[PDB]
Ligand binder design. Structure first.
Ligand SMILES: O=C(N[C@@H](Cc1c[nH]c2ccccc12)C(=O)O)c1nc(Cl)c2ccccc2c1O
Ligand SMILES: [Zn+2]
Length: 230
């Protein structure tokens, strides 16, 4: 029942309940000659919502807000982008116009601006060093170190033991490290180890792309990324 690229059209967004108060948002986009699905996270905090990552571009992200207001009906008050690539900050302008307060680490904001990407308004402090963690709303934000990108963040929802890895974490179907132009292949396995050590009670793990799983996703990512390096 988890949506796939064939089941979502580009421009459409689907939401998928993972737990009480926790959803993923799945979108599709054309990129690098392909059509790819992409995952994000929605987390209820009272009668409010925290958005984790855009839906990949203005158009998708507006549909995301419109799907949310239809299917959930609570306002998105804040959004965090987990790294600087356009698939995660694209739509930040739409969120801002909708009234959403957009956040990212200072390094993400720097890298986004230098890339010509949209820039979240607010800076997240206390995430500058590998292994740093801060509470942000009802989730924890963790910088495991460089992986898919130097700046990528992962997000833990302790109330539901749900771990959102973004593109630092690979679905089980994945056999390659993906688009590694911006990745630190040398550091990524160590970064996945910091995730694994910090979240041993994670019950559901959501990769940046594809199907959810359990803690098996982390070791899979580590396997793939190590084999790539060697
Ligand atoms: O989607 C990305 N990468 C994926 C690709 C992938 C492999 N296999 C897949 C299977 C399904 C969906 C996506 C995949 C991955 O690296 O794993 C992606 N990567 C980079 Cl650097 C980007 C840079 C700038 C702007 C957008 C980007 C982006 O969307
Ligand atoms: Zn990326």
């Amino acid at each position: 029942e988890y949506p796939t690229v064939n089941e979502i059209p580009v421009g459409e967004v689907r939401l998928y309940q993972i737990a009480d108060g926790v959803w993923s948002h799945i979108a599709t986009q054309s990129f690098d000659g392909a059509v790819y699905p992409s995952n994000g996270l929605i987390v209820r905090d009272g009668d409010e919502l925290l958005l984790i990552d855009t839906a990949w571009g203005a158009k998708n992200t507006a549909a995301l807000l419109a799907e949310i207001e239809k299917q959930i009906g609570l306002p998105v008050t804040r959004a965090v982008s987990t790294h600087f690539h356009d698939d995660r900050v694209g739509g930040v302008d739409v969120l801002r116009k909708a009234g959403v307060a957009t956040y990212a680490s200072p390094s993400t904001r720097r890298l986004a601006e230098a890339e010509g990407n949209e820039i979240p308004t607010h800076s997240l402090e206390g995430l500058s060093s590998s292994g740093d963690a801060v509470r942000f709303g009802p989730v924890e934000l963790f910088y495991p170190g460089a992986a898919h990108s130097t700046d990528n963040l992962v997000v833990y929802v302790p109330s539901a033991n749900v771990l959102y890895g973004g593109x630092a974490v690979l679905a089980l179907s994945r056999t390659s490290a993906g688009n590694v132009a911006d990745a630190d292949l040398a550091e990524w396995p160590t970064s996945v180890e910091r995730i694994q050590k910090h979240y041993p009670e994670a019950e559901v793990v959501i990769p940046g792309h594809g199907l959810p799983g359990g803690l098996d996703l982390l070791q899979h990512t580590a396997n793939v990324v190590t084999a790539h390096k060697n």
